[PDB]
Ligand binder design. Structure first.
Ligand SMILES: CC(=O)N[C@@H]1[C@@H](O)[C@H](O[C@@H]2O[C@H](CO)[C@H](O)[C@H](O)[C@H]2O)[C@@H](CO)O[C@@H]1O
Ligand SMILES: CC(=O)N[C@@H]1[C@@H](O)[C@H](O[C@@H]2O[C@H](CO)[C@H](O)[C@H](O)[C@H]2O)[C@@H](CO)O[C@@H]1O
Ligand SMILES: CC(=O)N[C@@H]1[C@@H](O)[C@H](O[C@@H]2O[C@H](CO)[C@H](O)[C@H](O)[C@H]2O)[C@@H](CO)O[C@@H]1O
Ligand SMILES: CC(=O)N[C@@H]1[C@@H](O)[C@H](O[C@@H]2O[C@H](CO)[C@H](O)[C@H](O)[C@H]2O)[C@@H](CO)O[C@@H]1O
Ligand SMILES: CC(=O)N[C@@H]1[C@@H](O)[C@H](O[C@@H]2O[C@H](CO)[C@H](O)[C@H](O)[C@H]2O)[C@@H](CO)O[C@@H]1O
Ligand SMILES: CC(=O)N[C@@H]1[C@@H](O)[C@H](O[C@@H]2O[C@H](CO)[C@H](O)[C@H](O)[C@H]2O)[C@@H](CO)O[C@@H]1O
Lengths: 312, 312, 312, 312, 312, 312
């Protein structure tokens, strides 16, 4: 159920076939066409104008560089281009039509009243053009390539954490020292590292770009609740599985019995854990805010136990 | 070990390099060439004719629109095109050669007797042509883009279900009401929702398109067996992980002891579960049937328990 | 380590051999001798006068009826009898000497300065006499047959309770009723009786007579602590094992799911339990107080559980 | 299956009815008769002479003081008494006949060839006499009152130890100290006392007198084996249940994590335990050796555990 | 709550003090008096005649040898004796008065209308006499010494069996044989003996004599129920703890894997078990029937397990 | 943190936009340009020359076919091409600049001193050219398409294996045969197949091409350690999840008890398992060696148990 951006968010319109983006400028000569991505080119950014009235459910595509809006028509030439007036003409309103299968993240930009669909191709000219909406070709599909967004915050819904698996893992058994009887001090040292896992999966809301790099703040099961381990300072990649080391350190001493051989077994509960969360983002150029819901999942550890027992 | 369709199933031949499909028509002028996908164009569909005799193991590619077969030769011009007779000429028989790595779902269409390989590119003309089979280039690879198939049924192999993980999850503890002694009624209400998971992974047989949308029928562990929960009415996407809510509802009352404070703990076993299955499909245009084996996997819950205990 | 009564407590001196008790009266003629027990005869009761000075560690035996004290001598005749003055003569001081084996609850009453030991027999006259302390015969042994004491209170040392064994016992499984789906009410009834056990064992202090009948107040394990079940109104016999019935009663109803067959399993933890205690007693004739420490032991039950589960 | 002493062991013959013992001396006048027990009187001790030949299975009763043997006859007077020659006359051989119920530890001493049974009573004279073996009266029963035996050793059959019950008992939970983070030392102290139980029950062999006092050496479950705790220095009473204190002492320190609140739970497994054993005894006057098999039973504790866990 | 025999059951009246029994014959001269027990003497047996009308709640004591009834009066001499007419005179009706403590199994035989209590002593004549009921002495107490009864049957109330403790006991671990790979046969043998325990404790009904010897039929826990092991052919002693051996025997073979070292662990659940029961008895001389309820208790074993596991 | 190949390893430079590779030959005429991949064309292979001195951190791109190095300049024409001298000119040194998001596996090849960036496109000529480094377009990105490498060995770091989940799965219960008593032989057969899982995930080091086919050697949990099952002979695909069958076979016989019905339950522990590993590879053309660290993960089974129990 596709995410369409609200009015103040910018994006590029990437064509499935052309693998190129639409541009709209005042000059040079060709004012609208296709181009390889250049994040710094205002020329390639657009935002949507939500139609109202008989246009409710449709959208106008406003150029960020020129402020003009796109149009698609069949009678007059050229069939596509820019024009003033934020949607003054019926030629400026488009219906966003999601594709299926390999095109489920893509969609056509069909302008109803003229029965025309936007075209983006590099195999035939004009590269940026339109076609009778009834004949569907793959080069009529577009996807959103949103503006660079900064992930400002991650807020976990700890109350809804969940243990998906759990098996005890003995970190260190050995660590058993003796001295017959009397003695006095027997201290142990524990330093075990476990490779943990982390994945921030999209659930709903703003569609963050896969691989987006952001930082720390990862879930942990306490003993009766889930909590956030602010120490994990690794760099995460949105939508992808990352790994990180967790080291358990501990030092404890014993000796006080009639005379025994002390054994120390350090154990932890390891397993798969997951927690819901909400991410807060804002436009780097505008500060425009949005949110994204997601579920965080990972292999983790909890309940570090130290068991002491004497022998003879 | 690549899936080659039987004789009555249609498909498009998508080129790795051109990202375009082969077409074969009677008119306009250029009767065979490349084109962006248009699912409604019979022009782009083909089926295979299984070679026999000295042609066993080879195939002819029959156009659905014209009924003619493709050919690849080096002497006479043009080197590729259409021709009558379901494989009358040695020029019509092809060897399907699977690629590796990034080309493991692709293959070359090599016509042995002429030592020629089909070509599909957009960087050089002719776009649809052939090349000496000994010199291998990426633009010689094709993949099947099968006709739209309807998923008519999913039959789970319940006897072979399997619990991959299991940990108790307390849905609701609290829910403990008192009234000292005497009293008479103490009823509790349980309404807890768990986000479940679902994935239909391909194992063998017909290669269903990733993302194909179909409906319900998902596995559940009873107490000693696996069963199908027909209530889950969510829309699934083949080959992809989906999520769905499961709500546990229950109402029970107590009170009948010498006078106590009743506590109610509702618990469930949550964990990863998987089950084998077979999907039955048919051509939307023909009704031609095929099957696909797969393994279904998901995070689930089972064995809802309600424990009652008095206090003082 | 024998219990010798303090100065204000009365008792009878029962002879091992004679199986008769010593009496001391002013009249009839024979003022001191032996007699079968008659609890109402003041004639048979005595109390001890704790020696001091060079008599510390020795005792005088004062008659309750006459107030006179017993004496044991060898020169003058008769060798035993009564005399005024609470221990005026060296003839009135006795050493209490515990026996062993079958005589561990008995003891000789040896009067040191004369080297004489009290005698209590029915096979030879005089029945009540003495003998040279160096020649030990069984008829020189006595035991205390204390005055009737009332058990006023039992105070358990709950903090020190202890579970000696524990095994779950299913009181009632069956109790599973259905009605397919919809329905609305499904209430269960539980009434199970377990034969419990109870024994009040002597540990130290006043030696209560075995079989003494007294009432209620018996230990029970709560969930984290031991508590006293004041409901058990059975009559106990000190030092002996008693039995008593414990009935578990409960009524609870369910039904609120999409439609299932409800099962109810009522379970308890049964096992051996024991707890230390102190008993407070007083003389029925005097009100003289004493205490007795003991350990209470018994087969019991705890943690009644009711588990609800649906089926299909 | 009654224990009859071998030839070199001495005993007294206690009568059920008379509750007196048989004596055989050279002087004064009455050389054989009844008497209250006097352990120092050689006069009351006897040993058995195992019959052989046609007397196999019968026994002669030899006086320790005079060395003569007892006889029972009907023609000549007196019917019972002493005589020289270790069983020269048929009058000296007796059949030991065990009684039942309240007489299961008693037996008649029947002299077959004369059809006479020994009598021991105080209600009619002669007190020590005989009666026609066919008419059985309670005063014809005797029991062995063996000479004082010293318990020299107890050897447990550890390999055959057995846990009859087992339940964890938390000795001390609390003992949890914090200091936020950093800190450095957090040591705990454990001192918990449990009242243990001990009983040495007769199984076979020499019948040790109930209540016989002897010392230490009591079973304990290690972790995989049973062992003897030589520290328990309490005084035991054969055949009776004794109690003794067991104190667990321990001191251990921790602190070494990123900063937590340490909790320490000391736990033990308590339950009923039993082990077979053999006791070695010898005559205090002779050094004559014998053994006694038995099973030792008691409430004990094992596997002291110390579990460390941090909190926040 | 003392067991008084119904009309057709015979018994002896044993005196607490005299430790002798009452006899009633037609000749010799003294027709009623005291005597040491002689089970074969009809002379010592009596049965009760349950009073009715104004005598309801009282009893007459009928001699088995003479058929006459006992009487207790104060005016006429002798005060006690025999008389014809099954209770014709008011002198023949007695009130049975249970004692307490050491006399809880004894009772006085008080004849109300004359205010007299039966006496049984050997320290003063007449030995069998009576006394003013208001002055209570120990020699006024009697207890029942019932006729020899045969235990014909024991019927356990299996449904009410109960596990009081339970701990796994490994009978034999070792028994692990290898041969690398291939091989073919690896059979194990199990022969382990456990010393079990058995006690038949009185609960209610006929008071069987302690120590009474009878045979087999002992409880066992199956897997979900209790059953009777008819194989245990040991001789039991009523009211006392007995022991008996239980041997577990088993032979099983394996070998069929890719090549491993087989280990076999034979384990059982041992613990304390108890079950209610009813015993059926009858008079050896009459066949008169009675029952006795009781609880059976013992250390037992159940659920023999054999676990097979390979190694490398 | 991108993997840049050391000096002796060859690769192709695939353009993000052109999806074509760079070639450098001596003839025909155009000596440098773009081309679809042809693994056999030496023409398309290059290796890097690690800059030193003021060029440390930069690289020269040496053609394998010609041995010449690439250059990028702005003054002189053509702006890009080949040249002798392994980095003689400042024009030959490039900075490798990793992209983000969809370009995280791609990078620009920027030549600093001229402020120029390599270009690879098919939408505008020249296809292989350069651009002012300050204006970034997607067609400036390249990725490594390494030479075919052979996976010579996989060495698991068994000591660091880890159980992520664990749940018992009963392979076969039923298999329970009887014959009442006596009998003699009762053998069982076990043959159960479980579909296991396997995935070799990249962690660090050489970036093996996804899908690369190689063979066997997969982890297994023993009982206390992880070991390699050399039997699994399946073909794996690097970076992708594969499946494989595991069959448990076993034959064992019993019968040796007093007469029972034998039941056999075969059980295993199934769950998710993972283990670190290092793969050793070498160039197929050179033998040049490299390594790749990775974590192996899969659904597995361990601890096959066979439990034997009798019934009646
Ligand atoms: C200038 C103009 O009107 N040109 C059009 C062509 O674009 C058009 O070609 C097709 O356009 C579709 C767009 O979805 C596909 O790109 C397809 O491959 C093209 O064939 C033809 C009619 O087909 O008409 C004019 O020439
Ligand atoms: C009309 C004709 O015969 N043309 C051919 C060219 O197609 C051929 O070019 C190559 O074809 C392969 C196909 O796998 C690749 O597309 C490659 O990039 C092309 O260079 C050349 C010979 O190379 O010969 C004729 O011109
Ligand atoms: C009156 C008097 O002095 N009589 C004594 C006897 O009592 C005494 O007899 C013994 O006393 C002891 C007491 O422990 C035992 O009862 C034993 O059975 C008796 O024999 C004798 C000496 O033995 O002397 C006087 O007769
Ligand atoms: C000297 C002599 O021969 N006396 C006997 C009596 O002892 C005997 O009395 C009985 O003996 C038995 C012994 O088991 C019981 O003690 C019983 O109570 C006595 O009655 C009588 C015969 O009965 O004969 C002689 O008098
Ligand atoms: C023949 C006669 O009447 N004798 C009685 C005695 O028996 C009686 O003695 C007491 O009887 C009681 C019975 O409970 C105890 O045995 C006690 O020890 C005896 O003293 C006396 C009165 O006491 O009267 C007559 O002599
Ligand atoms: C021969 C020459 O110098 N040509 C250049 C063009 O390549 C250049 O065009 C752009 O190049 C970038 C490379 O990152 C993109 O491909 C972009 O789409 C092109 O517009 C133009 C200046 O833009 O200048 C010359 O014509």
């Amino acid at each position: 159920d596709i995410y369409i951006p609200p009015e103040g968010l910018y994006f590029r319109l990437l064509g499935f076939a052309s693998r190129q983006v639409i541009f709209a400028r005042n000059s040079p000569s060709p004012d609208v066409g296709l181009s390889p991505v250049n994040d710094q080119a205002t020329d390639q950014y657009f935002s949507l104008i939500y139609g109202t009235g008989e246009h409710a459910g449709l959208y106008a595509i406003k150029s960020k560089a020129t402020g003009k809006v796109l149009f698609s028509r069949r009678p007059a030439e050229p069939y596509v281009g820019q024009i003033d007036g934020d949607g003054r003409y019926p030629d400026n309103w488009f219906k966003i039509e999601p594709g299926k299968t390999y095109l489920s993240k893509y969609f056509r930009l069909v302008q109803p009243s003229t029965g025309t669909a936007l075209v983006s191709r590099t195999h035939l000219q004009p590269y940026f053009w339109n076609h009778p909406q009834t004949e569907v070709f793959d080069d009529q599909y577009f996807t959103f390539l949103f503006e660079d967004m900064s992930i400002d915050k991650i807020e976990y819904d700890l109350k809804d954490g969940r243990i998906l698996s759990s098996t005890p893992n003995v970190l260190a058994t050995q660590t058993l020292e003796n001295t017959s009887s009397q003695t006095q001090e027997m201290s142990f040292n524990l330093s075990q590292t476990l490779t943990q896992t982390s994945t921030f999966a999209y659930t709903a809301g703003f569609t963050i770009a896969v691989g987006t790099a952001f930082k720390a703040g990862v879930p942990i099961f306490a003993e009766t609740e889930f909590k956030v381990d602010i120490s994990v300072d690794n760099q995460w990649n949105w939508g992808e599985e990352n790994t990180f080391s967790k080291t358990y350190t501990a030092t404890f001493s014993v000796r006080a019995g009639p005379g025994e051989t002390v054994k120390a077994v350090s154990t932890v509960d390891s397993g798969i854990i997951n927690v819901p969360f909400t991410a807060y983002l804002s436009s780097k150029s505008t500060g425009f805010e949005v949110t994204t819901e997601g579920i965080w999942r990972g292999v983790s550890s909890w309940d570090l136990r130290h068991t002491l027992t004497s022998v003879t």
